[PDB]
């Protein structure tokens, strides 16, 4: 295929490359904790009119 | 302002001649690059780093990857051939005799040393250690690491390892010591070494009797001259710069290729994922196009530089190939082709990515003034010296070889007769002794 | 990024978060969740080269995996997935040039036929299989040197050898306008 | 070895074929056909795509010339070597080792070939070597004698002087040798009788 | 395009209408009106040297 010929002469030919594909994706946690306190405002006793 | 050299004058005068009294054997070193680093490039990896979209966009650009790969492959094959031509000039590997006595000379500095695990001469190691201070590859990180790589740039090992190359230099040295020039022309014929040097003395026009009379003096000069080579080589003044320049040039070119990756080439940024993420796919490809072309043009430029650089290396290798054939394998009449002065013999020494030649040359010294005449009139017929010069020490006339002052009485054997006495200019009254 | 992740012996300053190599490629990263410094190495890759004796002299081939251990990337490894690389049963030889598959090694030394590199060459030899060997540097002869031994030829032969030298190449001209802008 | 001539032909043929194949490359444009772009894209924006093609073809042309220029330099170097070989080997006897054939060179015959030249080097190589015992000089009457153009040999009984390349022993005479010095200084001198005619 | 239109002996299979050369340039065509095989050759040209 690379030589584009049906016959090949004796020798050494570079053809392609091989690469190991990734197996699984992954992502890491910034360990975020700055949660928004808007929830407890919704979770309040009294509410303005 | 530069001073070209020390101003010198020689007292040219008719009938005035200067003849050396004796000589000085000098060993000069000459270094020639032979082969450069064999390199290959992963076309896709360099242009696109783990980007499928760039990989797709790379396909329709053309068959440049095939073209670039072919160009570098031709360089890599040529490099192995260059090494083969320089060193593989001996059909048969020769072994040094077990006894190292050669008419009073060493060759121990240039002969391979069995003590070291690497079958290399002491001089070879000094060449290796000095050059390898700035070297590349080493293990080549065959095990996991680095030496560039991971960008597509790889280094291919040479066909001939250093050890086998050293064997070739070892084989050439053994043949020259034991056989002189005979093994180069055909089958190797042994010849006692003092006789072999006597042959080479005749080649440069010095009668062999001179060598045998001063064999001890010559041997000491040769041994001492070799010793100076190690000190001069091990000295900080680096005559190995020519070999170093090849290493630097390849490293400088490869470093430029890596640097070119960071260039934006007119795009907003040099990060492929940044282009795709920040820009919409319609506009993103425009910047990708510029980056691909810019990286490509960088790759094309590097190939052209390598191809040009491959020329003089082959030219240097071709010159080295002739020098090994013309100087090592025989005496060379060509002036200054093999060292400075009258060439006697040359010893090849392998070097990283090159070869070092040790030219042994004959240098006259301690000249003396003499009075000379073109011919001698004895019996009404002019006498001409057959090989020598007609010299008068002041009150008597002698004939001596041109290079060495070995006066002899004028005899019919030393001089051939032709013509009368009046025609020639500068003829001189004298008597030609007849045995 | 993509690559094999492993723990690293590198030492990062507290504000340091990633590290780059000489080529300014990310070679180490500090994990966000855990303060551990993890080394990144690219997934194994390399060129593949095929040794063939010629189509008409058999069809067996030998594959060279350039610049990688046979161990890291054996016949188990995709790219050229139909290539099973035969199997581990097929002789696997480790050379400085790279992993070699489909050729065996012998102590006998012949002249080089197909230059693998790093002092290794392959050929088709006997039953007929691809064989890899170390180059025979040349036949070994020791010449008897002595103090007073001289060898003189008694008889000669006249030999005629041929040299081939290129002299000229094809002279070509290009009509640029037609090439760049045809019709 | 005619492949050396063949490789010159193939490289030019290969390079030209590569240039032809480059035309089909789109170079990031819509298509590789100049006419189709113009009918498909109006002049206000067609030149954007045409310029991509024009640059692509121009770059391919530029590389091809550069490759030819580099290759031409290699041929010229070969041509100069051939010219030197024709002058030094064909037109005269060359003392340079291995420049003309292998071994001592006698003559060279030039033969024309397509895009090159073939040299037939007539070389003299020795054979059938025979060992002998030698001595640097011969002591006859307290005076050292040195061979004038030969080397002293003996088969074991009688010493002889012969030429270096061919074995032709002769009786040591005052014509064959020139006398210099005395017998003590020369190392390895050997007693023998020097015949006087 | 511009060229010389001639009858062509190359046989096109019934589905085939276009023919291409080594350079991947259209070398033959089937006429839309009447199904016939026509090859296209560029008009005569040549370098001029003085
Ligand atoms: C030998 O050399 C000397 C000086 O180098 C020559 O002396 C002069 O030579 C020139 C050249 O013809 C004459 O014109 C002068 O008249 C010479 N000097 C005197 C004082 O006469 C000398 O001529 C040379 N020998 C010969 C034979 O020419
Ligand atoms: C030949 O030249 C050499 C130059 O070295 C002279 O050799 C020196 O001779 C003196 C006295 O015999 C010794 O002390 C030195 O050691 C010698 N030099 C070396 C390097 O060994 C020699 O005198 C010259 N010969 C003639 C006849 O002038
Ligand atoms: C040449 O003959 C000498 C004998 O003179 C030998 O070489 C060495 O010579 C020195 C001094 O004469 C002796 O001390 C050594 O013992 C000799 N070597 C040996 C191994 O005996 C030797 O016979 C000859 N040289 C060779 C064959 O290289
Ligand atoms: C041959 O040369 C060798 C190497 O210089 C000599 O052997 C050395 O002699 C020196 C004398 O100063 C000493 O350092 C050692 O004995 C040897 N080795 C080294 C590394 O120097 C030897 O004397 C010379 N002559 C021979 C062998 O006959
Ligand atoms: C030029 O001729 C000869 C050279 O051999 C020298 O003459 C000899 O001198 C020594 C002492 O100086 C005498 O013992 C010899 O008997 C002399 N022989 C002859 C044949 O004369 C002469 O001295 C040399 N000239 C100079 C200036 O040295
Ligand atoms: C060399 O010797 C010859 C022989 O004597 C010299 O020729 C003589 O020269 C003188 C004066 O010129 C004449 O009177 C004689 O008649 C000559 N005799 C012969 C036989 O020719 C010649 O002059 C000498 N050359 C030199 C340079 O002195
Ligand atoms: C945020 O990071 C901390 C540490 O930086 C994590 O704490 C881990 O688990 C316990 C409880 O804090 C500690 O004793 C461990 O030493 C921590 N492990 C490591 C590897 O650091 C904490 O779990 C992280 N936040 C979340 C939500 O997981
Ligand atoms: C001349 O005779 C000597 C003495 O035997 C030969 O030296 C040996 O020759 C044989 C075969 O010829 C070799 O196998 C030995 O290795 C030689 N001896 C050594 C120490 O190497 C010498 O070879 C003879 N000359 C020729 C041309 O054969
Ligand atoms: C010199 O060498 C030649 C060739 O190596 C040989 O000559 C051959 O001699 C045999 C027996 O006499 C003949 O049958 C051959 O025909 C000769 N060769 C040729 C080419 O004719 C032999 O070794 C030596 N010949 C002489 C005369 O010394
Ligand atoms: C060494 O060479 C000489 C020269 O041929 C040989 O001497 C001759 O040998 C032949 C054959 O026996 C006799 O016919 C001659 O009379 C010999 N010449 C003399 C002067 O005696 C000698 O035999 C050779 N050495 C050996 C060992 O054969
Ligand atoms: C060669 O012969 C000479 C002379 O026969 C030897 O030199 C010495 O000569 C004197 C008188 O001629 C004798 O009294 C000595 O006995 C000779 N020397 C020796 C060591 O016997 C010379 O030695 C001889 N050399 C050889 C190699 O035979
Ligand atoms: C192959 O990998 C092993 C570790 O798995 C290593 O020891 C060896 O050196 C590697 N091969 C080479 C040729 O370095
Ligand atoms: C020869 O004589 C000239 C003139 O006196 C002098 O300059 C020169 O040095 C002399 N040559 C030697 C070798 O002494
Ligand atoms: C190579 O194969 C071809 C086709 O099978 C054949 O014609 C040719 O003779 C073969 N070459 C040799 C050297 O056997
Ligand atoms: C051949 O070489 C291999 C390693 O290269 C070695 O293990 C073996 O002992 C050698 N000899 C034979 C007969 O296999
Ligand atoms: C109309 O087109 C068809 C298809 O090519 C053709 O066969 C027919 O002859 C055409 N009509 C005329 C009047 O030529």
From Swiss-Prot, chain D:
Outcome after substituting residue 175 to H: In strain: Alpha/B.1.1.7
What top-level branch of life does the organism fall under?
A: Viruses
Disulfide topology: 89-100, 139-183
Task: Report the coiled-coil segments.
Answer: 6-50
Q: Which residues are glycosylated?
A: 131, 155, 191
Per the UniProt entry, the effect of residue 7 to N is: In strain: Delta/B.1.617.2, Mu/B.1.621
Function according to Swiss-Prot or TrEMBL: Subunit of the fusion protein that is processed upon entry into the host cell. Mediates fusion of the virion and cellular membranes by functioning as a class I viral fusion protein. Contains a viral fusion peptide that is unmasked after S2 cleavage. This cleavage can occur at the cell membrane by host TMPRSS2 or during endocytosis by host CSTL. In either case, this triggers an extensive and irreversible conformational change that leads to fusion of the viral envelope with the cellular cytoplasmic membrane, releasing viral genomic RNA into the host cell cytoplasm.
Query: What name goes with this protein?
Result: Spike protein S2'
Chain's gene name: S
From the entire protein, which fragment is shown? 944 to 1140 of 1273
Curated annotation (Swiss-Prot), chain E:
Q: What is this protein called?
A: Spike protein S1
Interval of the full protein contained in this chain:
548 to 597 of 1273
Question: What is the role of the protein in this entry?
Answer: Attaches the virion to the cell membrane by interacting with host receptor, initiating the infection. The major receptor is host ACE2. When S2/S2' has been cleaved, binding to the receptor triggers direct fusion at the cell membrane. When S2/S2' has not been cleaved, binding to the receptor results in internalization of the virus by endocytosis using host TFRC and GRM2 and leading to fusion of the virion membrane with the host endosomal membrane. Alternatively, may use NRP1/NRP2 and integrin as entry receptors.
Species annotation = Severe acute respiratory syndrome coronavirus 2 (2019-nCoV)
UniProt lineage: Viruses, Riboviria, Orthornavirae, Pisuviricota, Pisoniviricetes
Quaternary structure note? Binds to host ACE2. RBD also interacts with the N-linked glycan on 'Asn-90' of ACE2. Cleavage of S generates a polybasic C-terminal sequence on S1 that binds to host Neuropilin-1 (NRP1) and Neuropilin-2 (NRP2) receptors. Interacts with host integrin alpha-5/beta-1 (ITGA5:ITGB1) and with ACE2 in complex with integrin alpha-5/beta-1 (ITGA5:ITGB1). May interact via cytoplasmic c-terminus with M protein. May interact (via N-terminus) with host bilirubin and biliverdin, thereby preventing antibody binding to the SARS-CoV-2 spike NTD via an allosteric mechanism.
């Amino acid at each position: 295929c690379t030589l584009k010929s049906f016959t090949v002469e004796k020798g050494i030919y570079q053809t392609s490359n091989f690469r190991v594909q990734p197996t699984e994706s992954i992502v890491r946690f910034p360990n975020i904790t700055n949660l928004c306190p808007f929830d407890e405002v919704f979770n309040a006793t009294r509410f303005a009119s | 302002t530069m001073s070209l050299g020390a101003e010198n004058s020689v007292a040219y005068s008719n009938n005035s001649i200067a003849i050396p009294t004796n000589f000085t054997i000098s060993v000069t070193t000459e270094i020639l690059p032979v082969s450069m680093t064999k390199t290959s490039v992963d076309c896709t990896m360099y242009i696109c780093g783990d980007s499928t979209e760039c990989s797709n966009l790379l396909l329709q650009y053309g068959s440049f990857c095939t073209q670039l790969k072919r160009a570098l492959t031709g360089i890599a094959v040529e490099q192995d051939k260059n090494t083969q031509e320089v060193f593989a000039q001996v059909k048969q590997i020769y072994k040094t005799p077990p006894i190292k006595y050669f008419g009073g000379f060493n060759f121990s500095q240039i002969l391979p040393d069995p003590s070291k695990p690497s079958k290399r001469s002491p001089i070879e190691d000094l060449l290796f250690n000095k050059v390898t201070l700035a070297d590349a590859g080493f293990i080549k990180q065959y095990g996991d690491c680095c030496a560039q790589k991971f960008k597509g740039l790889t280094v291919l090992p040479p066909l001939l390892t250093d050890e086998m190359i050293a064997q070739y230099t070892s084989a050439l040295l053994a043949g020259t010591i034991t056989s002189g020039w005979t093994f180069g022309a055909g089958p190797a014929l042994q010849i006692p070494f003092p006789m072999q040097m006597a042959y080479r003395f005749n080649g440069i026009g010095v009668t062999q009797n001179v060598l045998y009379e001063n064999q001890k003096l010559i041997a000491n000069q040769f041994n001492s001259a070799i010793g100076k080579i190690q000190d001069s080589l091990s000295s900080t003044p680096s005559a190995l710069g020519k070999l170093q320049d090849v290493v630097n040039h390849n490293a400088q070119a490869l470093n430029t290729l890596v640097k070119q990756l960071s260039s934006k080439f007119g795009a907003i940024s040099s990060v492929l994922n940044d282009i795709f993420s920040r820009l919409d796919p319609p506009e993103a490809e425009v910047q990708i196009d510029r980056l691909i072309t810019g990286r490509l043009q960088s790759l094309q430029t590097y190939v052209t530089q390598q191809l040009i650089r491959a020329a003089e290396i082959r030219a240097s290798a071709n010159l080295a190939a002739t020098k090994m054939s013309e100087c090592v394998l025989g005496q060379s009449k060509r002036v200054d082709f093999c060292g400075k002065g009258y060439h006697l013999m040359s010893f090849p020494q392998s070097a990283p990515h090159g070869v070092v030649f040790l030219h042994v040359t004959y240098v006259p010294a301690q000249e003396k003034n003499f009075t000379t005449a073109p011919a001698i009139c004895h019996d009404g017929k002019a006498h001409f010296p057959r090989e020598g010069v007609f010299v008068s020490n002041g009150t008597h006339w002698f004939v001596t070889q041109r290079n060495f002052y070995e006066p002899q009485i004028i005899t019919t054997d030393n001089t051939f007769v032709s013509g009368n006495c009046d025609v020639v200019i500068g003829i001189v009254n004298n008597t030609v002794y007849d045995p | 990024g993509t690559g094999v992740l492993t723990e690293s012996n590198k030492k990062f300053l507290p504000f340091q978060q990633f590290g780059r190599d000489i080529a300014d490629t990310t070679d180490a990263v500090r994990d966000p969740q855990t303060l551990e410094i993890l080394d990144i190495t690219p997934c194994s890759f390399g060129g593949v080269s095929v040794i063939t004796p010629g189509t008409n002299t058999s069809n067996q081939v030998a594959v060279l995996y350039q610049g990688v251990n046979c161990t890291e990337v054996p016949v188990a490894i995709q790219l050229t997935p139909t290539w099973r690389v035969y199997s581990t049963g097929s002789n696997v030889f480790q050379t400085r040039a790279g992993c070699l598959i489909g050729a065996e090694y012998v102590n006998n030394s012949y002249e080089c036929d197909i230059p693998i590199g790093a002092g290794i060459c392959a050929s088709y030899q006997t039953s007929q299989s691809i064989i890899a060997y170390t180059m025979s540097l040349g036949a070994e002869n020791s010449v008897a040197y002595s103090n007073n031994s001289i060898a003189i030829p008694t008889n000669f032969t006249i030999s005629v050898t041929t040299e081939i030298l290129p002299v000229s190449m094809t002279k070509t001209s290009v009509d640029c306008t037609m090439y760049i802008c045809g019709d």
